[PDB]
Amino acid sequence: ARRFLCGVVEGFYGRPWVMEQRKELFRRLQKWELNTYLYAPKDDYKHRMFWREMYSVEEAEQLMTLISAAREYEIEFIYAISPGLDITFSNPKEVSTLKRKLDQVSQFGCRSFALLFDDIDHNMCAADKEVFSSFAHAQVSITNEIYQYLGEPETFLFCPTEYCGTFCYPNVSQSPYLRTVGEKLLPGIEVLWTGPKVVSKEIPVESIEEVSKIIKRAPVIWDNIHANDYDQKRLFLGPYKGRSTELIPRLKGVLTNPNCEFEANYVAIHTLATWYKSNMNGVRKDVVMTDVLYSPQMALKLALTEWLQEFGVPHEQFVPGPNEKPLYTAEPVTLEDLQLLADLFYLPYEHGPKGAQMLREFQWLRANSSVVSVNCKGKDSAKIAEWRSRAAKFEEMCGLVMGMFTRLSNCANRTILYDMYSYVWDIKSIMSMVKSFVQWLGCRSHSSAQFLIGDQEPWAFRGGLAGEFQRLLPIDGANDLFFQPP
Amino acid sequence: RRFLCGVVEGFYGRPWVMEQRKELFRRLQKWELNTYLYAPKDDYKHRMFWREMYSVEEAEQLMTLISAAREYEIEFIYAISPGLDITFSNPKEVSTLKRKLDQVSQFGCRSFALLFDDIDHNMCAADKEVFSSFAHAQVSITNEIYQYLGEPETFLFCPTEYCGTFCYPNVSQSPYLRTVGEKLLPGIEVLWTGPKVVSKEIPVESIEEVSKIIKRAPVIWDNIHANDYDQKRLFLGPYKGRSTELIPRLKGVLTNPNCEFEANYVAIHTLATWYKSNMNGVRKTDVLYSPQMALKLALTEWLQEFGVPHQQFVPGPNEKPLYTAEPVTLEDLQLLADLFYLPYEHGPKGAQMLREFQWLRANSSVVSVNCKGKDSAKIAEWRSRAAKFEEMCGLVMGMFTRLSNCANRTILYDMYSYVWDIKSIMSMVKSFVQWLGCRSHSSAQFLIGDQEPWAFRGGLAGEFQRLLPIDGANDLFFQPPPLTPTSKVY
């Protein structure tokens, strides 16, 4: 019986989700007892780049249908807006534009709102510097004014420029900016925080205790963990991890900002749910000495067993004799399938256990390929027995990557595979070649040729040029490599 | 004089939609091409489950597509692939093949193809008791269907050995291809992808040789600009590799493009330029077609597709200036295509962009420590080149920024993954050059945020890629240790 915003924020750069997805997202948030959606796609011209522009007629059609579906499924809908690059804070025509706009969205029927000054510039126009002491004074000034103008609504969020640890000048505890915000932002307005980093691997309890104290209020975490709009493109099907259930009593909310690809955000949200549900009634426990619950590996196993249900089933008749060619058949996705997929495409900072192992083993076999190579007669009869045994469980395990792909690709409704096809087709491709290499390594004693695959050696082109460049950036070590014979 | 030029939709992966298939027809006609071949590998009723009749919702849509093709003056060819689980000897099986082609013939299809590509040579026992060979079976049934349909104008056969590499023991004396030649009814045309799957170039004798054993001229299935096989590259380069010479040695050309629908602009436009270049010729490096030229005519036309760049308040002269989106330009599209050129060679711009970066890297030594024998031709060579480089790393970021501030983002979003990764590494590369060039203002490690994200080799598949065998050259570069230790003990 305490208010807590927990859900999803669509806040990434890239081609935004469309309606029948958002409509699904709401079904899902509801089913798993979460309660909030933040609308803040970086690619909606009208949300940020071109904020002054009022929504179109066709646009108002779409926007209102959303807000109803949201209200239908018991999900608090928040409209967000980012004037920053463009805006001139002091000139009051500017402020009027902003109020008009949010009144249009108010009209479409949204009740809760949000301003963000995220990823903008530190510097004001001279015009504004003549009115305002600080950059922060500026933001707070008009944030407050809008807050009141819309009649001090229950839910209202402000995302500061300094939105995580590594972004406060000079440090969290004495940032003149975060002070001003803390002091002068109105008390009903909540603050968004992405943790100690932008994409924060862990969110220490003492982190939150610090930033809480300077902004005079327990923040709402915008959590960029499973987000994938930053570097090279990767996919994160791993669980919610790195935040203690202890955080929950010290927070007004957690809103996960995940993978651009929509269908990849099942586990990302499902586990966030389990995490919240686990300790939503806990009391502040004094864990930083200053005055059975939740397992990522379990929450994952639940989510994947449940995910299975959305992959759905795979695809007089003809019946071939016992010497006729046997009918193509489609098998279902297994659980073990998803469990491998999640481990291959896990979290930004580590792989999952099934994936970690395939590497360790490949890496062993590579570093021991010499033990079978004519060489010192036998040198050892049981060092060999091991490498051969150990090679053939690796051959077999590659096997299950190839199967994982086929069962996903035959399962009759391909909307989930298709939404992440590139990602899955890359790993399965490369494993095909890695299996073929380990085989070649078993046979290189009575040949001295080179490892080739239909004469092409194609793993060299992966990424094309994008990749050629990245492969020149600095590496620690060249103990590995395995050069090739001419 | 009747010659099949156009597009085959023949790729592994998610098929093109009705709405895109109509626009392909508009563009084919605009550019005066004539043919379309329906062979999407993912349509369950095309290959895997070929013996299921189309439902009414599906029948409805394929009638509409066929009508479309009629409206835009395009030959529509319905292919079918029964090679995975067919039992050749059994007649219920040939019945079914017939009934399925009859279903499609009533949707108003005039022309047809049978495909036996990307399968193994291994027949079942019942069949080995009846046909002399895999060819013999493939041929018996194809002839029988072709006839059953009243020997249509246009009927295609894709062989299992559909290129040089795939032949055994080799093109000239394959027993598979010998039999196709001898026994495949003369009326039927045969597909062929060149000497490889993705043929870098298609020499004229290569065609003379295959032409001889199949005893006809082939229609080329061209995988040059396809990415079905490797979904980490995109191919915005020009048709090239194939002499205008072989236009009279062929019966047609059907390109198999990128899976992404909107990357196939240059790839078709330049193909059409090439066909026109010599529609009417006789028998007996390439004087009528220049890729460099045909590429530029294509980029110039593609640009009007990208549309216009989005956009009563005025800022004071001391107030905060307005946002301003900028137009995409032609040096933008020229750089894009040059970064995403062809399967076997980069664009000259991209190719330079790299050569420069690898030089700067190799002569880092000179700017690492102090100054000694560091001339014009030592240091202030580097300093110069390094800033000429830095500026063009800049230009990449431009073309992304401007592509993503179009009013109509369709063309971008269809290639987002590819164009994003290129700009994100260029960014990451520029910062390296900077650090190289002032390793004496301190002596850090090279870092971003405060770790190194390029090291995640874009995924787990990435960390496996690096452990496969390596050139032995394009020499490495190493990150120095943290320098700052934490123990008394050595």
Residue numbers in the entry:
A (entry chain B): 57 to 347, 372 to 395, 536 to 706
B (entry chain A): 58 to 341, 370 to 396, 537 to 715
List sentences from the manuscript.
The regulation of O-GlcNAc cycling on thousands of nuclear and cytoplasmic proteins is coordinated by two enzymes. O-GlcNAc transferase (OGT) catalyses the addition of GlcNAc, derived from UDP-GlcNAc, to serine and threonine residues, and O-GlcNAcase (OGA; CAZY database family GH84) cleaves O-GlcNAc. Composed of two ordered domains, the N-terminal glycoside hydrolase domain forms a (β/α)8 barrel, while the C-terminal stalk domain is composed of six α-helices. α17, consisting of Glu676–Pro694, undergoes a dimer ‘swap’, playing a structural role that contributes to dimerization. Structural characterization of the human O-GlcNAcase orthologue (HsOGA-L/HsOGA) showed dimer formation both in solution and in the crystal where it has been shown to be promoted by helix-exchange in contrast to the non-helix-exchanged bacterial dimers.
Surface-entropy reduction (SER) is a concept in which flexible, solvent-exposed residues, primarily lysine and glutamate, are mutated to alanine to reduce the entropic loss during the packing of the protein into a crystalline lattice. Following the co-expression strategy of Roth et al. using pACYC-Duet-1 Gly11–Gln396 and pET-YSBLIC3C Lys535–Tyr715 plasmids, the successful pair of mutations was Glu602Ala/Glu605Ala (HsOGAE602AE605A). Therefore, crystallization conditions were re-screened using the HsOGAE602AE605A variant; crystals were obtained in 17% polyethylene glycol 3350, 0.2 M sodium citrate pH 8.0. The space group was P3121, which is a lower symmetry group compared with P43212 for the HsOGA11–396+535–715 structure. However, the structure was determined to a resolution of 3.3 Å, which was a lower resolution compared with the HsOGA11–396+535–715 and catalytically inactive mutant structures, possibly owing to the thin-rod crystal morphology compared with the large trigonal bi­pyramid wild-type crystals. Unlike HsOGA11–396+535–715, the C-terminus of monomer A can be traced into the active site of the symmetry-related monomer A, with Lys713 binding in the position of O-GlcNAc. Hence, the C-terminus binds to the active site of the symmetry-related monomer A rather than monomer B (as in the wild type). The C-terminus of monomer B could not be built in from Pro707, indicating that it does not bind into an active site because of the crystal packing.
